[PDB]
Amino acid sequence: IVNGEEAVPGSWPWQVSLQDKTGFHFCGGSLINENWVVTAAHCGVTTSDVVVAGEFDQGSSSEKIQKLKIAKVFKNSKYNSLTINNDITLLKLSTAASFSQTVSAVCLPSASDDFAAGTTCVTTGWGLTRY
Amino acid sequence: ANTPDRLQQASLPLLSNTNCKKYWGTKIKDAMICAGASGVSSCMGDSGGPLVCKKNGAWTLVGIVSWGSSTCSTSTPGVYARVTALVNWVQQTLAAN
């Protein structure tokens, strides 16, 4: 996030880090319950990647995180790799997340929910703070 | 050139499709929602993370970080997967698995 600010630690407890087997962060995601993470289709997640829940400081080796293996990847078959439309993938975890002070789920809307233009919302992540 | 160690956040407004199309034109498709152009920008490493708004007191997933300015410009709209257009697929997938 460019020109954002540091989150209060643990205050976005659905935010996960998607990492390869060496620990390299390549995408974010959101817990929607204890067994499922929703992320973007273009992230290209596979069952060799891992979901890291409970993280704040990726450079702290002492933080108490949950490293969760992925059992199955469900990319939306309508993802359009030319137009980027329908850019959503679900990850079924092989072991449940354990919900806690720092790990829990975001709510999902109904399909008919209307969020008005101009509403102040929030986005979070470990992406670049400068291009 | 490297990512921050510590989780970042940004407040930002949702944009109407009409105002989003003033920059991106026909690249905005029916399962996309725009937000930002407000002095902040999602950037490489943020993809797949949340765009949340409050609904009845609880944070609700409205977008998934997807694409935008190729230099993460803070004055152009960020584009997010529109969860309301995709949540029926989400629920069907959970119910079948």
């Binding site: 209060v8 643990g10 205050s11 407890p13 720092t102 829990s104 975001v106 709510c107 929030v122 | -």
Partner: peptide, 12 residues
């Protein structure tokens, strides 16, 4: 869902 145990603090 959607209610963090640690409340977020946003600038603005």
């Amino acid at each position: 869902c959607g209610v963090p145990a640690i409340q977020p603090v946003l600038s603005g």
